[PDB]
From a paper:
Human [name] ([name]) is a bifunctional DNA glycosylase of the Fpg/Nei family, which catalyzes the removal of damaged bases and subsequent incision of the newly generated abasic sites. Unlike traditional enzymes which are commonly referred to as highly specific biocatalysts, one special feature for [name] is its unique capability to recognize a wide range of substrates, including formamidopyrimidines, hydantoin lesions, oxidized, and dihydro-modified pyrimidine bases, derived from all four canonical bases. Here, by integrating structural, computational, and biochemical investigations, we show that [name] uses a triage mechanism to achieve broad specificity and reduce futile repair of normal bases. This mechanism involves two mutually competing interaction states: an activated state that commits catalysis and BER, and a quarantine state that temporarily separates and prevents the flipped base from catalysis via auto-inhibition.
We synthesized a 2′-fluoro-substituted stable mimic of DHU (FDHU), which allows binding but not catalysis by [name]. As a further test of the proposed mechanism, we also sought to “rescue” the activated state by mutating the lesion-recognition loop. Because a nearby positively charged amino acid side chain is important for catalysis, we attempted to introduce a charged residue in close proximity to the flipped base. Considering that Y244 is able to closely contact the base in the quarantine state, we envisioned that replacing Y244 with a positively charged residue might re-establish an active-state-like interaction between the mutated residue 244 and the flipped base, thus possibly rescuing the catalysis activity. To our delight, introduction of [name] to [name](R242A) or [name](R242H) mutant resulted in both mutants to restore their glycosylase activity; in fact, we even found comparable or higher activity for [name](R242A, [name]) and [name](R242H, [name]) than the wild-type [name] for DHU and Tg. We further solved the crystal structure of [name]([name]) bound to FDHU, and found that although the loop remains at the 244-in conformation, Arg244 forms a key hydrogen bond to the flipped base, recapitulating the key interaction in the activated state rather than the quarantine state. For instance, based on our mechanistic understanding, we rationally introduced an Arginine mutation to the 244 position of the catalytically incompetent [name](R242H) and [name](R242A) mutants, thereby creating new gain-of-function mutants.
Residue numbers in the entry: 2 to 202, 222 to 244, 249 to 290
The structure:
DNA sequence: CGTCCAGTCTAC
DNA sequence: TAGACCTGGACGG
């Protein structure tokens, strides 16, 4: 999951939890090496916001709930397979590693953080990850200025296809968005990042870093349904597609592209 | 049965 | 940098 999936996950949590009251504890699987959430409340609501490739849940006790409690914020990273699901309390999916339980009256549900591969992480404290740059979806102007003001950073010595994964500057861009972004402008993936970025000191590369992921968000989904899956595969122009070339960057990750690999190709 | 493929994080 | 962390779904034999 990339920025769009984190964003759609946060919309899922806000819409699905809008009229639910949670109660009790926050239960973690025995196999998850992530920390226990020390939170109990007889009546609380769950809300979410995304920033880049991170999501923040707020656990908000209702007036009078017991035990007394201040709101608790948790921040999640999804790694390669994370997602949120609202399931019936006795029909936990496999790999549901953190669980929030609806209070009565009404059907007993569980909001679940599901993570097949367990590369996902959560931290106590509502803080965004120090060092992550602004959200390409929700903080576009800050995102743009943070890149153009820091082209001296040795980050921009690297191929543009590698620079685009650096979450210090492109918080929310992953392996599918970098292919899709570079394909829209036919920028060779192994062009030097500083070359492509100095040259903008109709839409440019930093605009597409925002407008391309925004397109995915506008498809709908909930972190991505088995028909909204078809919508996504059809939107894709480059990542995985017949007729496209592919190489490994210096971190063994696969960049998809058409035409010139570019000057810094291995 | 087997291999290969699909975002960080951290010990050299 | 190269492993490391994980599971499962495509395939190949």
């Amino acid at each position: 999951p990339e920025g769009p999936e984190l964003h759609l996950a946060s919309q899922f949590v806000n819409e699905a939890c809008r009229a639910l009251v949670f109660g009790g504890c926050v239960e973690k699987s025995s196999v998850s090496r992530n920390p226990e959430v020390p939170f109990e409340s007889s009546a609380y609501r769950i809300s979410a916001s995304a920033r880049g490739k991170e999501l923040r849940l707020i656990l908000s006790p209702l007036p009078g709930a017991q035990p007394q409690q201040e709101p608790l914020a948790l921040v999640f990273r999804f790694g390669m397979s994370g997602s949120f699901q609202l399931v019936p309390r006795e029909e936990l999916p496999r790999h549901a590693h953190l669980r929030f339980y609806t209070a009565p009256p009404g059907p007993r549900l569980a909001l679940c953080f599901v993570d097949i591969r367990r590369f996902g992480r959560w931290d106590l404290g509502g803080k965004w990850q120090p060092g992550r740059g602004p959200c390409v979806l929700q903080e576009y102007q800050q995102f743009r200025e943070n890149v153009l003001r820091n082209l001296a950073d040795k980050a921009f010595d690297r191929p543009i296809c590698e620079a685009l994964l650096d979450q210090r500057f492109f918080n929310g861009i992953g392996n599918y968005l970098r292919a899709e972004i570079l394909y829209r402008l036919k920028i060779p993936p192994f062009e030097k990042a500083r070359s492509v970025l100095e040259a903008l000191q109709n839409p440019d590369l930093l605009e597409l870093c925002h407008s391309v992921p925004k397109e995915v968000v506008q498809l709908g989904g909930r972190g991505r349904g088995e028909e909204d899956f078809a919508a996504f595969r059809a939107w894709l122009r480059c990542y995985g597609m017949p007729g496209m070339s592919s190489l490994q960057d210096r971190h063994g990750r696969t960049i998809w592209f058409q035409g010139d690999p570019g000057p810094l190709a291995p």
